[PDB]
Ligand binder design. Structure first.
Ligand SMILES: CC(C)CCC[C@@H](C)[C@H]1CC[C@H]2[C@@H]3CC=C4C[C@@H](O)CC[C@]4(C)[C@H]3CC[C@]12C
Ligand SMILES: CC(C)CCC[C@@H](C)[C@H]1CC[C@H]2[C@@H]3CC=C4C[C@@H](O)CC[C@]4(C)[C@H]3CC[C@]12C
Ligand SMILES: O=C(COc1cccc2ccccc12)Nc1cc(Cl)ccc1C(=O)O
Lengths: 556, 150, 50, 49
């Protein structure tokens, strides 16, 4: 029954690779208890087992994906707080090996395990959603160093950007690092931070060029040189997007690429651009092409905002702004209902003779919406600011207004009630709405900053990983890198960090981490022996033992 | 004083977000509507300056909505133009998708005057609540330094 | 004054500097009839600084 | 005068802290554990009876 024998029978009659590998030393009993969910057995097996990092890490991958495959709430819960405590005492296991030997922990990370399937601890963490592991300061520093690989991770930012702008500045006293030519050149141009800087510069250049083409050089005439090079740049952008979707099993890659909604908005942006180019090239849909290109500028620019998120002083708050969307939905719904109400009330009280469908639709939503932001048509709504006349043949006072779209012929019979309704609208919308909104913004912002930061840690990690996977060249000249990588696929027809670790240095590191892990076992051994509750317990079994001993000597 | 000195990161944050969103909307507007005064300074003004005052009650509705302008053939290019009564909004604007123009203006007003400013309000409230004690102690120290110079 | 909260500020109706001086009343004072429709046909200006 | 004054006050401060860690709850559990296992030891010294 449960999740052991049914899965074993499935495997016999037949993360999934793990189940196939397993069939019916300390690692062996370890994984046996982890599949069997023997909690105490498992912690013992791990504690006295090898590869303690790496292995609490593999077992926590299995625990997390298992609790994700668990159809029962209780086993999922016990499995997941097992994962929580294993990951926690592992992250401070990593902290105690880190505060002991920086470089030794660093080379512990990028180690190949003959275990669960040759996934480095980082991959184990990402697949296990080990956000605690990622937020751990040690691995945070390592990922910072990798993002600044060979780039003197303590170098100032301004020096780095000046170096990027001045290629001769690389051979100076500034911007130190870890043929000195060519090699220094390649390291600089392949460092992930330099890749990001070049990509940002390219995107800014593209948005400048596209704005310039849209504003001044988009006549109905056939496209000019600027528009043609814009088309070429966008073709390069489309190519890089499709190639990174194809790179980071073709169907599986596509399906996983439909995720990462950032990528989704980038794809919708490029599909919009293709339709815009089609409309431009067809003579008829020229104005429509202009409009669609204009609305496409929106998606490019908003994509740049998510592109710029990596900044440490900016990233947590950019993650924050992504959590207010439900709030703006709430306030949108409430403004909409109250607004359509007040508008219908206004055009019910006052009767314009311009009872046209577009005029009514404008007057009922658009104008009252602008009444919130200081655009109040007081001289168009109040009888006291506007001149009387015999405008309409219907019996009653009308007083033609001076407005252009407020209706050519308004009614004034209950205009006092109209004024009172306007006062009520201004009281409710301009005061209650926005203010309760900003109060609940303050609340929702105060409840989400911490898990936004911890999430941003992993988000930044993912960005660093994918940018390390990105090709070196810039989108303007990414045609050379595309011909290279296509040739890396086209000169394949005729034909992620992975730093190597030494033999018996593996033994040194294992024993070192084994020594450190047994020190951490014995350290929390003193910690629990000195804990207040356990010392009360200890005094209890020293005083109940004492009373038992008195009972043993009671017959005296 | 220490707090208003410390809020500088937050004001930077709001500045960057406002800048990116305003350049977006300004370029979109100048693309969707085509004045015949497409001079470099005129475009530079219309794209940042005016949309900046769009946040503070200075809405050129009579300069951007078709329902408030008068129709005329102020340009030779086929299509309705309806020259505006403004001074620097161009001499001959375009109205082809003025419904979309109004919709984009509404989207701008929704994003700018609600989302960004109020999120920044929450940002100040948080950063004021989290550093006030450190500000007080640093003020003790700075006051001591100040009386030392005096 | 309720519209004064929401940006509707009749400055040209309220400040002497923005309204043209005229003898719109027989009372011995300075009036400067304002151009507002319901701001009063003839207002006073003795303590308009106040 | 000031030296001896501040020294007297410092030794009163040390005695205040020494006694404060003599009614603190954690150290009182510590001293009670010391008393109880000393009692265990001394009962061990009389077990041969
Ligand atoms: C970060 C960037 C992409 C944001 C977009 C800003 C763009 C739309 C702004 C910045 C500078 C502006 C340019 C200023 C001067 C000129 C020269 C003129 O003969 C054509 C228009 C053109 C080219 C303007 C078009 C709009 C413009 C390019
Ligand atoms: C609070 C929110 C929902 C306000 C929404 C404002 C909308 C509804 C306003 C703003 C501009 C207005 C539009 C202006 C122009 C047109 C083009 C016409 O051919 C159909 C009516 C239509 C489409 C109007 C309908 C109402 C309108 C779309
Ligand atoms: O880009 C986004 C979200 O983008 C949008 C959301 C809603 C409306 C939009 C309207 C226009 C353009 C983009 C929009 N990214 C993410 C969102 C979430 Cl909830 C988690 C992670 C990410 C991520 O990128 O990692």
């Amino acid at each position: 029954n449960s999740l052991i024998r049914n899965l074993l029978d499935q495997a016999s009659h037949s993360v999934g690779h793990v189940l196939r590998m397993l069939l019916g030393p300390w690692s062996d009993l370890l994984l046996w208890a982890l599949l069997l969910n023997r909690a105490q057995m498992a912690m013992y097996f791990w504690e006295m087992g090898s590869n303690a990092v790496s292995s609490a890490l593999g077992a926590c991958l299995l625990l997390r994906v298992m609790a994700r495959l668990e159809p029962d709430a209780e086993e999922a819960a016990r499995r997941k707080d097992l994962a929580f405590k294993f990951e926690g005492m592992g992250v401070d296991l990593f902290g105690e090996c880190y505060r002991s030997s920086e470089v030794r922990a660093a080379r512990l990370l990028l180690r190949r395990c003959p275990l669960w399937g040759d996934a480095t601890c980082l991959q184990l963490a990402m697949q296990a959603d080990a956000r605690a592991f990622f937020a751990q300061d040690g691995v945070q520093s390592l990922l910072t160093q990798k993002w600044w690989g060979d780039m003197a991770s303590t170098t100032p930012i301004w020096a780095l950007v000046l170096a990027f702008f001045c290629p001769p500045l690389i051979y100076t006293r500034l911007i130190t690092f870890r043929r000195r030519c060519l090699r220094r050149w390649f390291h600089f141009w392949g460092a992930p931070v330099t890749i990001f800087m070049g990509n940002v510069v390219s995107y800014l250049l593209f948005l400048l060029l596209f704005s310039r083409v849209l504003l001044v050089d988009f006549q109905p005439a056939p496209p000019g040189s600027l528009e043609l090079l814009l088309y070429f740049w966008a073709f390069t952008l489309l190519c890089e997007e499709l190639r990174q979707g194809l790179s980071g099993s073709l169907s599986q890659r596509l399906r996983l690429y439909l995720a990462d909604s950032w990528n989704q908005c980038d794809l919708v942006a490029l599909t919009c651009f293709l339709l815009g180019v089609g409309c431009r090239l067809t003579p008829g849909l020229y104005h429509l092409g202009r409009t669609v290109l204009c609305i496409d500028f929106m998606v490019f620019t908003v994509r740049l905002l998510h592109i710029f998120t990596v900044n440490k002083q900016l990233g947590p708050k950019i993650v924050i702004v992504s959590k207010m969307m439900k709030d703006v939905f709430f306030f949108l719904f409430f403004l909409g209902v109250w607004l359509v109400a007040y508008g219908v009330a206004t055009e019910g009280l006052l009767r314009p003779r311009d009872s046209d469908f577009p005029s009514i639709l404008r007057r009922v939503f658009y104008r009252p919406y602008l009444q919130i932001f200081g655009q109040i048509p007081q001289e168009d709504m109040d009888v006291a600011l506007m001149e009387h006349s015999n405008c309409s043949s219907e019996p009653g006072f009308w007083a033609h207004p001076p407005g252009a779209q407020a209706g050519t012929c308004v009614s004034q019979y209950a205009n006092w009630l109209v004024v009172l309704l306007l006062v009520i609208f201004l009281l409710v919308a301009n005061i209650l709405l926005v203010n309760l909104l900003i109060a609940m913004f303050s609340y929702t912002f105060g409840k989400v900053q911490g898990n936004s930061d911890l999430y941003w840690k992993a988000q930044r990690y993912r960005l660093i990983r994918e940018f390390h996977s990105r090709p070196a060249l810039a989108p303007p000249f990414i045609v050379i890198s595309h011909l290279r990588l296509l040739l890396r696929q086209l000169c394949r027809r005729p034909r992620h960090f992975r730093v190597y670790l030494s033999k018996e240095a593996e033994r040194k590191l294992l024993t070192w981490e084994s020594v450190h892990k047994e020190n951490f076992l014995l350290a929390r051994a003193r910690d629990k022996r000195e804990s207040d509750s356990e010392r009360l317990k200890r005094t209890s079994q020293k005083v109940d033992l004492a009373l038992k001993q008195l009972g043993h000597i009671r017959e005296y």
